[PDB]
């Protein structure tokens, strides 16, 4: 039954990642209007980078602040909120 316990741990990690949907992030590899890049949550001293896609069909260069508006397994969906 160990494979079901491993599946339960992976589904729990997917739920921990879906909790990040309520937070801002920061793009470090460009995300064009129909493409893929990379992001980190704004807690940069205690968080991990993930792949990212442009939820609002926007071009999202390096070094901008984004809202993680939807989430899939290691593939976050983001848009440039750029808050104050």
Curated annotation (Swiss-Prot):
Phenotype reported upon loss of the gene: Alters assembly of FloT membrane rafts; more diffuse rafts are seen. Double floA-nfeD2 deletion mutants are wild-type. No visible effect on FloT membrane assemblies.
List localization entries. Answer: Cell membrane; Membrane raft
- Domain of life of the source: Bacteria
Q: What induces it?
A: Expression is sigma W-dependent. Up-regulated by alkali shock and by infection with phage SPP1.
Query: What is the protein's known function?
Result: Plays a role in assembly of FloT membrane rafts, probably recruited to rafts by FloT.
Provide the family line: Belongs to the NfeD family.
Q: What is this protein called?
A: Membrane protein NfeD2
- Kindly list the organism's lineage: Bacteria, Bacillati, Bacillota, Bacilli, Bacillales
């Amino acid at each position: 039954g160990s494979h079901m316990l491993e599946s339960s741990a992976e589904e729990s990690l997917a739920y921990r990642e879906d909790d990040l949907r309520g937070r801002l992030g920061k793009v470090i590899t460009a995300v064009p209007v129909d493409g893929f890049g990379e992001v980190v949550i704004e807690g940069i001293g205690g968080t991990i980078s993930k792949s990212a896609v442009s939820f609002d069909n926007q071009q999202i260069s390096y070094g901008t602040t984004v809202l993680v508006v939807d989430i899939n397994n290691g593939v976050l969906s983001v848009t440039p909120h750029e808050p104050i």
